[PDB]
Design a protein around this nucleic acid. Structure first.
Ligand code: MG
Ligand code: ZN
Ligand code: ZN
Ligand code: ZN
Lengths: 187, 107, 1390, 97, 134, 84
DNA sequence: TCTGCTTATCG
DNA sequence: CGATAAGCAGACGTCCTCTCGAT
RNA sequence: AUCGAGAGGA
């Protein structure tokens, strides 16, 4: 009648028990708090699951409550100094022009609520309009490569760590932004 | 007693202790629209003198440090204008004796 | 004491803390330390001179302390010391050292700001050492100048001193720093200067904050044993004393030669590091571990920490000798205060008994019996330190018992033990019991002593504790005995009542069909232990001598007991046998239930405890049980499953009830689906639906339950257990036979865990009852699968709520006890504490112990003025309103006597003064109140024991009654002082009781109703006076602890509605909560007008905050450059209406819905003027009329304006205000009932409109006109502390605590809650029960140790050099002394 | 068996002072120590059987007093002494003046 | 049968209703620090062997342990071994002062590191007494 | 540092704590077989002997009731009233 | 889950 | 440069009976 | 015997 499933170790039949953890590599949107600057956060926890624990927790937050009109959106990065604006991230990737960015975030050009919600990020990234400069913000002229390293070998590793794919990370970040804004609209 | 109609600056409350005696009492107007002592939960506080206070301090074997204290910012301490350590009697009504004397010193 | 000396046994009185001067520890220490090796290369008996050997003692337990030379037991351990060269910081003081440098410029060596500065007299003159520091350091936090306003002193700058890790450096204006510099500037700092910082010239000087040489603890702080003899043994502390020393050697290596840039500080940093972590492991920075792995370190602090540390766990409580523990079982044939003690346990515990002529015979016999025969003894002690071991000794039978010898005899029958049940919530859980040695290994209990312990007999184990001296068994017998604790100070009621089988069968026994024959009655009679032996005459004789249960039961009730009680339908003939009448200890009518014997307030236990005494009542417990148990034994009682089966017609008739509920829910659903749900005020169109449908289903459930309950015959066993209140409630019947009802998670319907459905066997967006957690079936009917799952969700929430609220409750009691502890009535009957600060001047405001108080009425308060007139009026000068000569010997002898009517009108005058005075306090009209002497139970105790003739006249004159009453009040005493203050306080203390006294001892009353005589009246006077003098509290009574418990035990039973109710409310009330989850206002109407719903709606419409944002459908910006012609096709008429007799061309249009403009009556003109008033002349604003179809507001500003318009709109949606108060959020009009005096005198209840709000800004809410600003109530007591003074905050706080407690149908007597509220209130403003709320006081450092922060308090007391008078409990308990508490309040001598 | 502070509360509410000292000294750890009337700490060397008592660092050899405290309290005071805090124990509440 | 308690039929119990077997399996092994010293299973001497358990060794054989079938009660030494130090010193293993029964059996077998190691199983019948939880 | 035997304010009735301390001290004296001051009607339990001497008030002791200001007042067990 | 150091905003 | 008002890091939620591993 | 974890009972 014995069922097995245990390990005899120095006499005692020790048992491994099941452990519970939140699933990796999935898009979650949690509102931070009531009295906080951040009103919304898009988290994704990322590990390769073939390699052991390239733990990367990406937070794409949003600033300002319902009353504040400065709805600037930033995002965090592994090994980075602090949370940088999203348009600078897109210019770091293959997408320079404002509005081609929008095609990665908003999937119906007749959704003026979500479109209008996005305007202040463009002004946060008005002061950057080329790729070479987008990596340059990230921090002595090697920083760009450093940035690209963070963009390839650290940031969003649950896609890949090859330099060839940056459109995938771009569309996926746009999907994260879509989820975040779609929650912020109360939909 | 200075009744101001809206509010004062920090430089206006910087001269309250200016004149050594005769100290000035700065009161708002929205506070004095309604009498707080007319609310049911507020009893009839009663000032007393240094002689009545000394009678309290000897007929109870008490040092000043032992009285249930009140503060100069207390609304009914303002209402009666309590100075440093001016003691009050408080006639409280309760379910047990129906009358109880409380004594309060002014911190 | 294990020897004698030419030294006296002194006691510890005051304890002075401080710091170790290095100059001192160098001398106090017996020996140095030279090197770190704990053991020896030779590894011999000595360990080496280098560490913990030389004249410090050793481990072979024989004669090993070099210094003491008195062995291993009498060696305290004579401290050693290191003499390290480089001084470093003491981690406990790090913040303080930072602050001390802030007040002295480095080159000065003296304070920053002198007495010349007048911005110090408000602060330096505090003279309260460590309170001053908090302000005077902030004064000195940022001054960089150190030199007429310029006197002698240096002028150099000093850095804005910052710290990182374990050191501190900072920029002067850019700089570095060192440790020796800090020590240097403190030896140079003057004597008078640090004394204002909170220091002492000899006990703690800041030069000793820095440690030049640390002391080493003796070996008794370093144990070492091992399983293997041939190996090492070491305590954890030694490892790192040796680590510190190893660091002390690195520095000598770097001393012998040069030290490069790293060797400069890398060695000193780590040396101070190891000293730092010697004292502490957790600094929220570097975490570190010992060589042996497992994050292990000394962290001496953590020795003393909360959970299981030294102070909170080894001094507040100890593993103790003479202790026991086992499972429990209830034995009816045990008496109440008896305890069943197993034979093996009584064969193990010993009481040392001294030899004296009366016990020497039995003591000799006990020695003869020895340890394994039960009435024996384990040891015998001679007149020396020589023990005799009876279990194996040669002379075990050859004993010569000299006098004064000690025999450690076995615990004997009928001795005092202390019985405990964990958790010890209140002091009825630690009670002295009388031993009875029984077999079978289980502690035996009386049945009716379950309740004060809260123990079932399902395994709940209990403890037993045994005294060791005569004084302590006396203290148990006379203070802690169970019969004493029968009636309890908390709830002013008894805690022990007849329970569960006795009680279940008592109702069966006292029915009107319950008849008993002779053969049974005889056994019942002999069963009662203390009875005369006289057979009662059978109530019925006629064909067969039979007996009633009331008859043979009244044999258990002692004569002289009288009891009245009335219920619904209780005439003087009770046809449903309702209520209860008892006279002379005999039952006259009624059915006996929980109301009469179930530990009730006005119950036979509370009656017999006071009248007869405690012993008679404790014996009464057993005397009732032994009869009723028996009658149940031979009559029997069961409970089947047919007890839940109701009629086929009934069971069907509840299902149609659920069916009509389903019709109702479906109809309201189809209504809401058509947008026709006109959601009422302040509630969502969804919240309306949820609340309404939940109401529907709960009403259907209650209807089905009470439709089943009506169908339970008088045979149904569940009904008969509910009937006595044995163990049963209504809802039990409802869920088990009708319908369990509706489950709920987080105070709401079942959740939408799946997207738009509740379970994947349902469609989407199903808001139906079955889909939302309603169970149409009952436990008997059988729950379906989905229903079982939803029930499981609800039950799991119930389980976690229990497991969490119990933990919170225990924390509540911990804080409460540690706060109120040592609030003890002093000898002047004045509630006080250690310091002596008065909390209450009169305990409970009357000086009366809560045990003797009883709920009695005052007939004066209620009733018409005409009914009051019929009483108490004595118009001798009238033919009709005089005492008829039928009632008095001199009835017509004093008719019209003037000199008597003087006193009689004086009596009526003070009666009327009394009525108005009492009506002025108790404005509800409630007369039933706790009063210290039960007068009616005296009157029946005089109408009985004096055999009054109810037709003859009395023998007292009016003079007698009136002056005797007036002289009785002169001798009812609480305080005995000799001067006016204390006499006024005594008058005030007995005021209310005198009101009751005259209410019941009036001339008309005494002579018409009571029909008293002179002899019995004088008896009644003496009796009332004596009972009163008995009811007064005793000095030494610790009511602080008792009050904390009297709040804590009820809080345990508070398991669970628009407000924060119950335990969360209590947690925020006690923590005084700056922000609360349910703030509210209770708003009362005009005194003249309180029933006009028009003005109620008006006030509601003038208080509810309204933002323009709350009505704006759309805010849109247009380009419209030429105003006379707009671009919008439905706007040109509005612009044409500006004809009646320059801009920016950037329009701002706003569109508002018409619904919210009508939900709160609103016009376009009002909103338009509010916008115009906000922007006074910086915005042109027009609008469309109310009569239109689309409400629109248009605005224009009066280069670079593409962006500077939107921010105006943003401030125009947030910082606007319409008609409303700032913080208010909603309001509801509700009609309250209100008892009020009708003109003719009677108290009739009137209805009045009251407004309940969300949020509070009372400071200007009360000023709002049209309301009663003499009544308006804010549940937030914290705002009421700020608005209406403090004496109103005390009252609001007590009201909140009350409503918390009494929301569970509970009752705690006013004393304890009022004491808690006071103790928080007396310290200036509101004081919370937290680590920083009350423990922030200056009570005593050792007293503060017992609560959360321990080494923080100890360090601050050592720095500030506090002084502990050791006049509180925890102080003495730390040093194990008889605290001046209870028995210790007073000294005894010749 | 543990005598928890939850039980000390109940043994305070009843008023059993001597029972509490019993169950916190005699029925548990208890200890006799020698205290210097000048120092105030457990410094005095107690070599009994000859009435030899002295306090190093304070020269006291006549003004010494014995006391009764829990050994846990002696341990606490010792750990404080090793932590540089001096909980001076004085025999009378009256200061000299 | 008050407060969630019950009564059990003693006639039924005496027939064996709700009767239990309870085996406590004690264990030990020697050579705690091998290649320097070595402990030895034996019934020790009372002379120059120091920490002699105050209980009786007289139920122990010369190999230092009991045989199956012996009744044991209280502080009976069940397994005896000594630890030498510079004679032998006691390392015996008594019973639990709370229980009593009969030696069910004994198992003698060396460990992975070759060393004498013993498992002694003691057995007791437990009858439903008056307070046992059900 | 004193008080008079007149001008006393505390309750003349014996508190239960005074009663318990008195009975315990007396029962201790009797357990150590010190001289007893009444006759025993067959009472060997020393606490009950203390209670007998209490009902007779032949226990020569005094209660020094302490006042929070350091004052006190004495009450001989011969003087106090016992209604508990 | 509340507090007591900082830090920069404001007059 | 004397107030004010945001930060951003800080802490604790009775007994008791086994067994195990590894210092 | 010390430490630390886990498992249950109240
Ligand atoms: Mg139970
Ligand atoms: Zn010694
Ligand atoms: Zn200077
Ligand atoms: Zn000294």
């Amino acid at each position: 009648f014995d069922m097995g499933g245990y390990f005899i170790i120095n006499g005692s039949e020790k048992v491994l028990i099941a452990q519970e953890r939140s699933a990796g590599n999935i898009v979650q949107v949690f509102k931070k708090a009531a009295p906080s600057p951040i009103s919304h956060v898009a988290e994704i926890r990322s590990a390769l699951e073939k390699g052991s624990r390239f733990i990367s927790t990406l937070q794409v937050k949003l600033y300002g409550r319902e009353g504040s009109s400065a709805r600037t959106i930033k995002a965090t990065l592994p090994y980075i100094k602090q949370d940088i604006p999203i348009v600078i991230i897109f210019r770091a990737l293959g997408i320079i022009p404002d509005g081609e960015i929008l095609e990665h975030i908003c999937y119906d050009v007749n959704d003026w609520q979500m479109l209008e919600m996005l305007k202040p990020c463009v002004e946060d990234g008005f002061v950057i309009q080329d790729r070479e400069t987008a990596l340059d913000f990230i921090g002595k002229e090697k920083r760009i490569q450093y940035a690209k390293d963070i963009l390839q070998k650290e940031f969003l590793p649950h896609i890949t760590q090859l330099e060839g794919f940056e459109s995938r990370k771009a569309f996926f970040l746009g999907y994260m932004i879509n989820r975040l804004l779609l929650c912020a609209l109360d939909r | 007693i200075f009744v101001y109609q809206n509010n004062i600056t920090p430089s206006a409350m910087k001269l309250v202790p200016s004149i050594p005696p005769a100290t000035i009492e700065t009161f708002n107007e929205a506070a004095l629209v309604v009498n707080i002592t007319h609310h049911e939960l507020v009893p009839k506080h009663i000032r007393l003198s240094s002689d009545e206070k000394r009678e309290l301090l000897k007929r109870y074997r008490l040092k000043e440090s032992q009285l249930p204290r009140i503060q100069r910012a207390d609304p009914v301490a303002l209402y009666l204008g309590l100075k440093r350590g001016e003691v009050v009697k408080i006639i409280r009504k309760s379910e047990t004796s129906g009358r109880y004397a409380s004594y309060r010193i002014c911190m | 004491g294990q020897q004698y000396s030419s030294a006296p046994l002194r006691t510890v009185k005051e304890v002075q803390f401080g710091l170790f001067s290095p100059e001192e520890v160098r001398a106090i220490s017996v020996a140095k330390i030279r090197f770190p090796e704990t053991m020896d290369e030779t590894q011999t008996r000595a360990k080496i001179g280098g560490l913990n050997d030389p004249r410090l003692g050793s481990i072979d337990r024989n004669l090993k302390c070099q210094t003491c030379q008195e062995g291993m037991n009498e060696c305290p351990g004579h401290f050693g010391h290191i003499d390290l060269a480089k001084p470093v910081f003491h981690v406990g003081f790090i913040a303080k050292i930072k602050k001390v440098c802030e007040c002295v410029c480095m080159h000065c060596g003296k304070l920053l700001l002198d007495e010349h500065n007048e911005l110090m007299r408000q602060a330096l003159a505090i003279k309260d050492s460590k309170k001053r520091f908090a302000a005077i350091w902030t004064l000195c936090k940022t001054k960089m100048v150190c030199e007429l306003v310029s006197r002698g002193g240096c002028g150099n700058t000093q850095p804005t001193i910052r710290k990182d890790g374990l050191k501190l450096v900072g920029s002067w204006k850019l700089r570095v720093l060192s440790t020796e510099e800090i020590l240097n500037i403190f030896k140079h700092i003057s004597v008078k200067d640090f004394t204002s910082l909170g220091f002492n010239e000899v006990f703690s000087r800041p030069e000793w904050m820095i440690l030049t040489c640390l002391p080493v603890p003796p070996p008794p702080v370093r144990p070492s044993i091992s399983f293997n003899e041939s190996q090492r043994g070491e305590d954890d502390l030694t490892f790192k004393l040796a680590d510190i020393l190893k660091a002390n050697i690195s520095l000598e290596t770097l001393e012998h030669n040069g030290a490069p840039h790293h060797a400069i500080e890398e060695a000193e940093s780590l040396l101070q590091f190891h000293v730092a972590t010697y004292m502490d492991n957790d600094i929220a920075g570097q975490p570190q571990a010992l060589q042996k792995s497992g994050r292990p370190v000394k962290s001496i602090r953590a020795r003393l920490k909360g959970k299981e540390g030294r102070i909170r766990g080894n001094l507040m409580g100890k593993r103790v000798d003479f202790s026991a523990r086992t499972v429990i079982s209830g034995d009816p044939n045990l008496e109440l205060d008896q305890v069943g003690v197993p034979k093996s346990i009584a064969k193990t515990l010993t009481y040392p008994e001294v030899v004296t002529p009366y016990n020497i015979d039995r003591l000799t016999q006990l020695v003869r019996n020895g340890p394994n025969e039960h009435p024996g003894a384990k040891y015998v002690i001679r007149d020396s330190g020589d023990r005799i071991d009876l279990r194996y000794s040669k002379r075990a039978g050859d004993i010569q018992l000299q006098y004064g010898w000690k025999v450690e005899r076995h615990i004997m029958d009928n001795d005092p033990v202390l019985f405990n049940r964990q958790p010890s919530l209140h002091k009825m859980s630690m009670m002295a019991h009388r031993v009875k040695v029984i077999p079978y290994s289980t502690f035996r209990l009386n049945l009716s002593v379950t309740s004060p312990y809260n123990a079932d007999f399902d395994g709940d184990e209990m403890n037993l504790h045994v005294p060791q001296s005569e004084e302590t068994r006396a203290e148990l017998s006379q203070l802690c005995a169970v019969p004493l604790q029968i009636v309890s100070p908390q709830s002013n009621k008894p805690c022990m009542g007849i329970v569960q089988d006795t009680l279940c069968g008592i109702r069966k026994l006292t029915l009107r069909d319950t008849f008993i024959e002779l053969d049974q009655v005889l056994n019942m009679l002999y069963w009662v232990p203390d009875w005369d032996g006289v057979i009662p005459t059978p109530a019925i004789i006629k064909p067969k001598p039979l007996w009633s249960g009331k008859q043979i039961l009244s044999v258990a009730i002692p004569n002289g007991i009288h009891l009245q009680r009335f219920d619904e339908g209780t005439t003087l003939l009770s046809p449903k046998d309702n209520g209860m009448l008892i006279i002379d200890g005999q039952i006259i009518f009624g059915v006996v239930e929980k109301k009469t014997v179930g530990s009730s307030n006005g119950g036979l236990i509370h009656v017999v405890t006071r009248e007869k005494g405690p012993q008679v009542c404790a014996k009464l417990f057993g005397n009732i049980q032994k009869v009723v148990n028996f009658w149940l034994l031979h009559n029997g009682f069961s409970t089947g499953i047919g007890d839940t089966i109701a009629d086929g017609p009934t069971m069907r008739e509840i299902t149609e009830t659920i069916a009509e509920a389903k019709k109702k829910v479906l109809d309201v659903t189809k209504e809401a689906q058509a947008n026709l749900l006109t959601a009422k005020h302040g509630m969502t169109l969804r919240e309306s639906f949820e609340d309404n449908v939940v109401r529907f289903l709960n009403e259907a459930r209650d209807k089905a339950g009470r439709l089943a309950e009506v169908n339970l015959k008088d045979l149904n066993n569940v009904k008969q257990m509910v009937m006595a209140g044995s163990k049963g409630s209504f809802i039990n019947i409802a869920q088990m036979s009708a319908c369990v009802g509706q489950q709920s998670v987080e105070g709401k319907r079942i959740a939408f865990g799946f997207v738009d459905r509740t379970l994947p066997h349902f469609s989407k967006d199903d808001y139906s009852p079955e889909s939302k957690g309603f169970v149409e079936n009952s436990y008997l009917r059988g729950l379906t699968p989905q229903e079982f799952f939803f029930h499981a969700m609800g039950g799991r929430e119930g389980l976690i709520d229990t497991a969490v609220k119990t933990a919170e409750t225990g924390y509540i009691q911990r804080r409460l006890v540690k706060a109120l502890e040592d609030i003890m009535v002093h000898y002047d009957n004045t509630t006080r504490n250690s310091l002596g600060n008065v909390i209450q001047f009169i305990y409970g405001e009357d000086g009366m112990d809560a045990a003797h108080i009883e709920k009695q009425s005052l007939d004066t308060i209620g009733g018409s003025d005409a009914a009051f007139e019929k009483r108490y009026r004595v118009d001798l000068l009238n033919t009709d309103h005089t005492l008829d000569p039928s009632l008095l010997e001199s009835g017509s002898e004093i008719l019209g006597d003037l000199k008597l009517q003087v006193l009689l009108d004086e009596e009526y005058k003070q009666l009327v003064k009394d009525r108005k005075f009492l009506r002025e306090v108790f404005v509800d009209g409630e007369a039933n109140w706790p009063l210290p002497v039960n007068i009616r139970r005296i009157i029946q105790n005089a109408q009985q024991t004096f055999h009054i003739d109810h037709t003859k006249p009395s023998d007292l004159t009016i003079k007698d009654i009136v002056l005797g009453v007036k002289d009785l009040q002169e001798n009812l005493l609480v305080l005995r002082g000799k001067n006016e203050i204390i006499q006024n306080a005594q008058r005030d203390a007995v005021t209310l009781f005198c009101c009751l006294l005259r209410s019941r001892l009036a001339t008309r009353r005494v002579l018409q109703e009571y029909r008293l005589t002179k002899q019995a009246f004088d008896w009644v006077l003496s009796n009332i006076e004596a009972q009163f003098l008995r009811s007064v509290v005793h000095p030494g009574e610790m009511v602080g602890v008792l009050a904390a418990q009297s709040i804590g035990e009820p809080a345990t039973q508070m398991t669970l509605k628009k407000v924060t109710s119950g335990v969360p409310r209590l947690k925020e009330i006690l923590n005084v909560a700056k922000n609360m989850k349910t703030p509210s206002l209770t708003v009362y109407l005009e005194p003249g007008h309180a029933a006009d719903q028009e003005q109620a709606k008006l006030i509601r419409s003038a208080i509810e905050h309204t933002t323009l944002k709350s009505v704006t459908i759309a805010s849109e910006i247009y380009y419209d450059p030429d105003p006379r012609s707009t671009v919008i096709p439905e706007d040109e008429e509005i612009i044409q209406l500006h004809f009646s007799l320059q801009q920016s061309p950037w329009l701002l249009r706003l569109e508002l819905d018409r619904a919210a403009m009508n939900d709160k009556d609103l016009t376009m003109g009002q909103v338009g003027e509010r916008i115009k008033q906000t922007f006074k002349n910086d915005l042109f604003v027009i609008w469309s009329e109310d009569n239109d179809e689309k409400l629109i507001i248009r605005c224009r500003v009066v280069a670079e304006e593409d962006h500077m318009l939107k921010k105006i709109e943003n401030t125009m949606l947030e910082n606007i205000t319409l008609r409303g108060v700032e913080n208010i959020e909603r309001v509801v009009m509700m009609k309250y009932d209100r008892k009020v005096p009708s003109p003719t005198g009677e108290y009739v209840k009137e209805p009045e409109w009251v407004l309940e709000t969300d949020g509070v800004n009372l400071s200007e809410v009360m000023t709002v006109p049209g309301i009663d600003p003499t009544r308006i109530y804010t549940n937030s007591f914290i705002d009421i502390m700020e608005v209406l003074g403090i004496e109103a905050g005390r009252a609001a706080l007590y009201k909140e605590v009350y409503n918390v407690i009494a929301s569970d149908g509970s009752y705690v007597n006013y004393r304890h809650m009022a004491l808690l509220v006071d103790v928080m209130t007396t310290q200036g403003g509101l004081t919370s029960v937290t680590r920083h709320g009350f423990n922030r006081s200056n009570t005593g450092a050792l007293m503060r140790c017992s609560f959360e922060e321990t080494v923080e308090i100890l360090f601050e007391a050592g720095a500030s050099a506090e002084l502990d008078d050791c006049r509180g409990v925890s102080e003495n308990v730390i040093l194990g002394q008889m605290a001046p508490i209870g028995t210790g309040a007073f000294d005894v001598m010749i | 068996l543990r005598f928890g502070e939850m039980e000390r509360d109940c043994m305070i509410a009843h008023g059993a002072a001597s029972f509490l000292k019993e169950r916190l000294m005699e029925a548990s750890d208890a200890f006799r120590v020698h205290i210097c009337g000048i120092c105030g700490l457990m410094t005095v060397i107690a070599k009994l059987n000859h009435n030899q008592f002295e306090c190093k660092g304070c020269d006291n050899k006549i003004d010494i007093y014995q006391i009764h405290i829990p050994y846990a309290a002696k341990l606490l005071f010792q750990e404080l002494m090793a932590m540089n805090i001096t909980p001076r124990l004085y025999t009378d509440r009256s200061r000299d003046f | 049968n008050q407060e969630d308690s019950m009564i059990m039929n003693q006639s039924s119990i005496d027939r064996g209703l709700f009767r239990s077997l309870f085996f406590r399996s004690y264990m030990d092994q020697e050579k705690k620090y091998g290649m320097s010293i070595t402990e030895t299973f034996e019934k020790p001497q009372r002379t120059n062997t120091l920490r002699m358990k105050h209980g009786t060794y007289d139920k122990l054989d010369d190999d230092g342990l009991i045989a199956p079938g012996v009744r044991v009660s209280g502080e009976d030494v069940i397994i005896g071994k000594t630890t030498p130090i510079s004679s032998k010193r006691d390392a015996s293993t008594p019973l639990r002062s709370t229980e009593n029964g009969i030696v069910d059996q004994v198992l003698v077998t060396t460990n992975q590191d070759g060393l004498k190691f013993v498992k002694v199983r003691v057995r007791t019948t437990k009858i439903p007494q008056i307070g046992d939880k059900f | 540092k004193a008080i008079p035997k007149d001008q006393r304010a505390t309750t003349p009735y014996m508190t239960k704590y005074e009663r318990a301390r008195i009975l315990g001290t007396r029962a201790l004296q009797i357990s150590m077989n010190a001289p007893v001051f009444v006759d025993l009607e067959g009472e060997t339990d020393p606490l009950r002997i203390a209670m007998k001497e209490l009902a007779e008030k032949k226990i020569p002791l005094v209660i020094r009731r302490y006042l929070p200001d350091g004052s006190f007042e004495d009450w001989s067990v011969e003087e106090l009233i016992v209604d508990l």
